[PDB]
Amino acid sequence: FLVTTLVFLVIGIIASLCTRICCNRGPSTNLLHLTLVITATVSCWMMWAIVYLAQMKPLIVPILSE
Amino acid sequence: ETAPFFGFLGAAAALVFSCMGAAYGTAKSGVGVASMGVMRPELVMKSIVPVVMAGVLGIYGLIIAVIISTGINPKAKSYYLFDGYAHLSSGLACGLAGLSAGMAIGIVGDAGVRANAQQPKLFVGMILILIFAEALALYGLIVGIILSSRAGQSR
Amino acid sequence: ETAPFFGFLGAAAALVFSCMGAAYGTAKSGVGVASMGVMRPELVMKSIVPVVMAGVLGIYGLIIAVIISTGINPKAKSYYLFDGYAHLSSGLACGLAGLSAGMAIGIVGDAGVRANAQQPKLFVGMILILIFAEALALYGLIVGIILSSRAGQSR
Amino acid sequence: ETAPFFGFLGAAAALVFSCMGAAYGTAKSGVGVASMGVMRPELVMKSIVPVVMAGVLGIYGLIIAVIISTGINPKAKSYYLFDGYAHLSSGLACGLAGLSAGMAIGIVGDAGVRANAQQPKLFVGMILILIFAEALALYGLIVGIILSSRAGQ
Amino acid sequence: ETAPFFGFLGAAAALVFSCMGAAYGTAKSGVGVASMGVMRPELVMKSIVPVVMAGVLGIYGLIIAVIISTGINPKAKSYYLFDGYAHLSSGLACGLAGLSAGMAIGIVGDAGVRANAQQPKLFVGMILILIFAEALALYGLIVGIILSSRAGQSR
Amino acid sequence: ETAPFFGFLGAAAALVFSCMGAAYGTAKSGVGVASMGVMRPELVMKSIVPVVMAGVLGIYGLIIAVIISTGINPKAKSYYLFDGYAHLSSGLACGLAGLSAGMAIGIVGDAGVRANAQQPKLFVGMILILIFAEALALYGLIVGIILSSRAGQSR
Amino acid sequence: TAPFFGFLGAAAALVFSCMGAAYGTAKSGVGVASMGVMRPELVMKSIVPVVMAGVLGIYGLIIAVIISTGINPKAKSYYLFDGYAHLSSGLACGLAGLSAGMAIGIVGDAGVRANAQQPKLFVGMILILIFAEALALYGLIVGIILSSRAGQ
Amino acid sequence: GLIYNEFFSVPFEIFSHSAYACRDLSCSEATTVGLIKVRDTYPFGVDPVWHGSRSELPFLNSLKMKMSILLGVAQMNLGIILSYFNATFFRIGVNIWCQFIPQIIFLNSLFGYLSLLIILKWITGSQADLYHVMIYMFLSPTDEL
Amino acid sequence: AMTFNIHGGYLEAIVRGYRAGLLTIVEKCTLKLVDEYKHMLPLSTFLEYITYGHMIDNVVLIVTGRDVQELLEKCHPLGMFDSIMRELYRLVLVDTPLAPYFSECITSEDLDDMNIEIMRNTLYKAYLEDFYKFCQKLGGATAEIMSDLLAFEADRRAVNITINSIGTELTRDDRRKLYSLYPYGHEELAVCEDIDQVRGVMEKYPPYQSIFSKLSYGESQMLDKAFYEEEVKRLCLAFEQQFHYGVFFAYMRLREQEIRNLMWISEC
Amino acid sequence: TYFRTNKFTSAFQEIVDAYGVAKYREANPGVFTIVTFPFLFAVMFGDW
Amino acid sequence: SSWSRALVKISPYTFSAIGIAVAIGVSVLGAAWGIYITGSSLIGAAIKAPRITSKNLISVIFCEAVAIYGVIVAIILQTKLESVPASQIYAPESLRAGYAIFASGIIVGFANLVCGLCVGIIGSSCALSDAQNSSLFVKILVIEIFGSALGLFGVIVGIIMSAQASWP
């Protein structure tokens, strides 16, 4: 949960370092790349947060078909 | 009993049918009068006579509806099934007669607008058809009043 | 017992019929005014009278329906089937009269738009026809009001 | 016991009739708008006024349906027939008014598209006609709300 | 006992009416696209928007039908007539909204496909009109969702 | 009980409506194919795809009917009224969806075949339209399968 | 008592099937005469589509025969389920045959004209008509399956 | 798809072993008061048991609806926020503060009650709300209650 | 479908037999065809419209006068029927479909019907009115043939206008205002001022594509001959004449074409 | 004016530009949508 | 319930007689319609040329065959009638026999009508085709004969259903 929350954030920083190294050829190009990386990280983390908050403490238990 | 379930319904239907017939006749007459006035503005004022004559249907229907409504009064005397059935029949007859008269007057006026626009000589003479239609409406109203007069005949 | 069903049905029928008649009249008036909006925009502004008349007829129908609805207070006095039948009949009559008047006014305005476009001198005739048509709606509203008032006389 | 079988049906009919009237109006409005845009692309954006106003009828119908759905509260009070029948009648009236207004607005917009294409000087008249037509829908919605308000026996 | 019949019928009616509306819209759009794309290849893909815009309504209807079908669970709760009536009402509303949206979308898409050969500046307006029309499908889905949510709370 | 008298009726109606829709599609598809191949026999083979696309609806309906028929077995369990009602609802929904999809596919395919020889891009456009139409049939089949499966519990 | 519906199923199955069969044969026949006015040889071979339409009547006739044989009252107690099943089985077969024949008539009528214009497309018309005619066979399969459920 | 824990229309081994375990039920049916007791939440994806269960439809539908609402709120917020950046980049007039601020505030606040309620129900586990009573709370326009 | 056997079957069979038998000599053949058509007297309205087709031209010719008495020499009952100069035009406004509309559209009489070009304009307007009236009676497959004929007439008039009649005030607006897919997409021919431009405009309709071809023949003629000759060449489609359908107009057109071919034969 | 298009960004920019253009240096929603559209179209087809 | 009981209590003899009469009536109507359809074309061809009267008469004979088959079916149904005893007026055997008679009559009538319409249309086309060319008369006659089998199949089905009559 909260440990995984930092894991997603930490994953972006390494990706941020790779993006900076790759796009250092262009400053304005690097600025655009950083926005894309941040947006992708935020979207993935939000999707995971929704998927985890839904099943964290379910209100309805799962019944299995026969 | 369940007298107003038919008597009041017939009283309403009388005015409804009379209004529908008068509306149809007035619409046809107004279309004709508008066409005639477009042809000649001089005859527009003089050609409103059929339009006014078509309005007698509304007055007759309103009078019949008022009479029928006044004819229902459980406080004064209880009305049986017959007392309501007779009023409903009178209202239906009055409404149907008014609708037929309105349709006939509308058709006659639609023809007469063009007839007067073409030949002014026949303009005044054509009013005979409207007079006959008004007489038919009056006869229907008289029949309806005669039928409704039997409200107190029950026992 | 089941009288509120009849009363609510009558009120709904009144509202629906009035709305349908007003819609038909407004559509006919707009179809007529579409040409006047280009042929002579100066006279087009004065051509909005039939739409206003149709709106007035719809407003009268809605007012009658609202009065009928306000007449139903079960907690104040028990609604016998007589009162429900009377209210339903009043609503049906008002709705039918409003629909007929709206259709007639719509046809009259559709004709009168072209009639006035051809000649401005036909505005007086168009106004007279519209007033005569609205008289029917006024009579229908009066009849509905009388019937609604009489609906409470049961015991 | 059978009151909900009428109230839910009335709400559904209100929503359905409002949607049908809105679609009937919007079909003619869109046809006229496409014709005008093909003829004159300059005023295409400003000609969507009837198209936009068509959705107001659907919004009002959805609001009436939501109100009717909130009206049916069996736990709050045992739903007698006097409430279910009134709710069904209110829904029917609102739906019929919406359908009539939608048909009228469709006819008005179909005329007004060509009217503005020939001369944009009639835009004010077209807007006034559309407002007069929508007055009927507003009156119908008000009547439906008033009727639904009488669910207290 | 008979309530599950009403609920299943309502779900089936929702699915069937949504499918019919989507089919009508898709057929109209296909006719328009076949007419338009003969002259130019632009209509082959740049104007295939309504083809999927109409199927979106069918997808929404299928989702609503699946939700309604999942709503019924006799082994979990003995459904009274309230549940059946609510399910039938929700299904009817969803299906009717889907049919209306399908018809409107089909007409608008046919008009847009016909106008595609005209000035391409109207593509934005056509897309806006299509979205405004498709908003009815979302409104119907919302109404059906609300009805389904309120359905299970029967006493 | 009387549940089979509805369940078997729904199962039969599914296949009947699916066959009607398939025939309605195939007639238009064949007419369009003949019209196209009268002038350009080369594209006749490429124009036959919508015919098979429409015919797939018949196979889908047959599968749904087979599932519905296998879903009823009094010797296995007491088919209560709920099970029969749900089976009938599933059959009706699947049949109506199939009929609508067949009609839409037939119209679209006839239009595309008529436009097939005008431009070779029609070979892709009509195929895409037919696929989008058959998506609705697949969705209806899935909904019918889900309803038939849910019909098996019946408390 | 219920067996009235079961008996009605067999009659309906044949009646509705023949109703579509005649309509398909009429449209197919009319086109054949039109082609036979000018193209003498093409008309003789084109009669196959009419023959194909007439086959649908045979399929309905066999389905009716099975339903009639299974309505033996003195043999086994024809409960309401058997009557309901037989009526349902006939309804599908009759309705499907009516639709299947209607498509064949519409397709066949155009096919005669197409063959008279370009003889090359004759193979294509046969393929489409054969595919359409499969729906009647599909209806026949459903009829057999539904009728087979008369066990209890 | 990895987030959804569905691979080629089939579940598989999540990063955890089993999110939910049948409470007792060594021989008892799944549909029971005990139902399934969850040891811990599977972090990689949805619970594998939920996908194939009878209760798959309601829970998955509620989760998908909540995710769609949240994603729409986020997209609308981003689009509204882009307005200020566009106004500053083009050096637009005071119309941004005049109109863009209320435009981005009204819709944001209107959806904020629903988004916060969804989050709180997810966070606080307020089962007295579920998917339905959230809309029920949002339904009432009047005060009190 | 059963209505054909209910009524009109015998007349349809007689018409089909007469058409199948078909193949001052030209005048004699025209008189024989006219007699066969007259002896044949729902389908009454169709026959009236078919006669009014040529009756419009007959009335236009009779509208002259100016050696007007010579019109009796061409009193062919097929088109020159007596039942089908503003004072005489008002009298002739009856018993014809296009006459009431032409009374208002051609109210200028000879002013809008000058024998040089404006008479052709009045004839084209009358032909357009007659074509609209015929298309109004929809319900059969002949609607496509009528639309094709009207499109051919309109396109031929537009081509003639763009070729040389543009100097006669037959401008782009007059290509549809006075010169009678065409009912919806005739605007493409308003700018076809060249033979190459005419072919490009024809390219908008793939069926009309390659019909113009080199345009050396057919399109070379003015008035209504340019695209009408395309319809004459494609009349093999009309030769199909599928049964159980209105084929009286097709038979009349085939007889007229045969008469025209016989006249064109003349002295070999 | 048109913003400079990269080798990979060109397709997404063209897809987004189908709604129109802007000023010489005005707002360019293509920058966000280059990843937003993949960030949203994935959900509707999520199956690994 | 009460309405259902009344519906189930209807007399089966009336329904059986209605079906028996309706079979003959529908067969006669269909045969007459087909005869008129063929006769219009035959008269037109004769007006064109009286050479093909013998060829045309085959269509009329085929159309009248439908009426003959319907009359035979009606005679069989009349033979199938019984005394209708008062005691067994509502017996299961009587109800089954009445339902079977009604079903057989309806099937026979509908099949005869369809076959008559198809034969009439085919003959109307065939007469015109023969007028166009006498060489095509053989194929048209073969097609008409093949299409006439609908009435025979319907008659066979009705005869098979007729064996179900068991009225005491």
Q: How far apart are CA H37 and CA D136, in angstroms?
A: 58
Q: Which residue has the tokens 């229908």?
A: C140
Q: How far apart are CA K56 and CA I268, in angstroms?
A: 43
DSSP A63: P
Would you say G137 and F15 are in contact if contact means Cβ atoms under 8 Å apart? no
Provide the b/e sequence for I167-200 (b: ≥16 CB within 10 Å).
Answer: eeebebebbbebbbebeeebebbbebeebeebbe
Kind plus residue range of the DSSP H or E element containing H36: strand H36-38
Query: Does the beta carbon of C80 lie under 8 angstroms from any beta carbon of chain B?
Result: no
Would you say D51 and E131 are in contact if contact means Cβ atoms under 8 Å apart? no
Q: F36 is written with which tokens?
A: 């196209």
Residue type, H113: Y
Nearest CA in chain K to I9: K40
Q: Which residue has the tokens 């089976």?
A: F87
Would you say D26 and E154 are in contact if contact means Cβ atoms under 8 Å apart? no
I20/K131 CB distance under 8 A: yes
Q: H13 is written with which tokens?
A: 């081994």
F136/E5 CB distance under 8 A: no
Q: Which among I253, D33, J7 has a CA at the least distance from the CA of E128?
A: D33
Resolution (A): 4.0
Phi, psi of E117 (to 5 degrees): -65, -15
Measured on CA atoms in the order F146, F152, G3, G7, is the torsion positive or negative? positive
List, in order, residues 6 or more apart from C151 with CB less than 8 Å away.
Answer: C71, C83, C86, C87, C90
- From the number of C-beta atoms within 10 Å of its C-beta (0-12, 13-18, 19+), residue D104 rates as buried
Q: How far apart are CA H17 and CA G147, in angstroms?
A: 50
Q: E94 is written with which tokens?
A: 């969803």
List, in order, residues 6 or more apart from D126 with CB less than 8 Å away.
Answer: C37, D49, D50, D108, D109, D112, D115, D116
Cα G129 to Cα G32, G36, G50, G123: the distances in Å are 15, 20, 11, 10
Nearest CA in chain A to J28: A32
Interface of I with G in 225-264 (CB under 8 A): 240, 242-244
List, in order, residues 6 or more apart from D131 with CB less than 8 Å away.
Answer: none
Q: Which residue has the tokens 């007729």?
A: K162
H131/E75 CB distance under 8 A: no
A40/J35 CB distance under 8 A: yes
Q: How far apart are CA I78 and CA I251, in angstroms?
A: 13
Nearest CA in chain C to B64: C143
Q: In Å, how far from its chain's centre is CA K110?
A: 7
Q: How far apart are CA H19 and CA H40, in angstroms?
A: 5
Q: 3-class SS at H37?
A: strand
Q: K32 is written with which tokens?
A: 């007459």
Reduced to 3 DSSP states, what percent helix, strand and coil does chain E have, rounded to the nearest 5? 85, 0, 15
Contacts of C19 in chain D (CB under 8 A): 96-97, 100-101, 136, 139-140
Nearest CA in chain E to D37: E122
Would you say H86 and J27 are in contact if contact means Cβ atoms under 8 Å apart? yes
Count of helix runs (H) and strand runs (E) in chain H: 5, 2
Crossing angle for the helix pair D123-148 and D49-71, to the nearest 10 degrees:
0
**Residue from E149, E150, E153 to probe the interface with H (highest H Cβ count within 10 Å):** E149
Contacts of J27 in chain H (CB under 8 A): 82, 85-86, 89-90
Crossing angle for the helix pair F3-39 and F81-114, to the nearest 10 degrees:
10
Would you say G93 and F13 are in contact if contact means Cβ atoms under 8 Å apart? no
Contacts of F12 in chain G (CB under 8 A): 88-89, 91-92, 95, 142, 146
Q: How far apart are CA K147 and CA I139, in angstroms?
A: 29
Would you say E131 and D52 are in contact if contact means Cβ atoms under 8 Å apart? no
Q: Which among I73, I65, I115 has a CA at the least distance from the CA of I92?
A: I65
Q: How far apart are CA D22 and CA D30, in angstroms?
A: 12
Distance in Å, alpha carbon of G131 to nearest chain K alpha carbon: 22
Measured on CA atoms in the order I125, I128, I134, I138, is the torsion positive or negative? negative
Q: How far apart are CA D24 and CA D17, in angstroms?
A: 10
Q: K12 is written with which tokens?
A: 């089966």
Of K36, K48, K120, the CB nearest to I13: K48
Q: How far apart are CA I30 and CA H29, in angstroms?
A: 96
Crossing angle for the helix pair B81-118 and B4-39, to the nearest 10 degrees:
0
List the Cα angle F88/F90/F91 in 5-degree steps: 65
Q: D102 is written with which tokens?
A: 């939608």
A1/H41 CB distance under 8 A: yes
Q: How far apart are CA F1 and CA F72, in angstroms?
A: 13
List the Cα angle K122/K123/K129 in 5-degree steps: 90
Contacts of H140 in chain D (CB under 8 A): 70
Q: How far apart are CA E40 and CA F119, in angstroms?
A: 8
Give chain K as a 3 state SS string.
CHHHHHHHCCCHHHHHHHHHHHHHHHHHHHHHHHHHHHHHHHHHHHHHCHHHHHHHHHHHHHHHHHHHHHHHHHHHHHHCCCCCCCCCCCCHHHHHHHHHHHHHHHHHHHHHHHHHHHHHHHHHHHHHHHHHCHHHHHHHHHHHHHHCHHHHHHHHHHHHHHCCCCCC
Would you say B6 and C86 are in contact if contact means Cβ atoms under 8 Å apart? no
Strand H36-38 vs strand H20-22: parallel, antiparallel, or unpaired?
antiparallel
E–H CB contacts, 8 A cutoff, strictly below: 15
Phi, psi of D94 (to 5 degrees): -60, -45
Q: Which among G42, I7, G19, B19 has a CA at the least distance from the CA of K114?
A: G19
Q: How far apart are CA G133 and CA G56, in angstroms?
A: 8
Would you say D74 and E151 are in contact if contact means Cβ atoms under 8 Å apart? no
Nearest CA in chain B to C7: B5
List, in order, residues 6 or more apart from K10 with CB less than 8 Å away.
Answer: none
D107/C27 CB distance under 8 A: yes
Q: E8 is written with which tokens?
A: 């299943």
E34/F104 CB distance under 8 A: no
Start-to-end Cα distance in chain D = 15
Q: Which among E105, E96, E94, E89 has a CA at the least distance from the CA of E55?
A: E105
Contacts of A32 in chain J (CB under 8 A): 31
Would you say E68 and E148 are in contact if contact means Cβ atoms under 8 Å apart? yes
Within 13 Å and on the Cβ side, how many CA atoms surround I222?
Answer: 12
Q: 3-class SS at I211?
A: coil
Q: How far apart are CA B92 and CA E13, in angstroms?
A: 41
Cα B87 to Cα B12, B14, B71, C84, E58: the distances in Å are 11, 10, 8, 18, 55
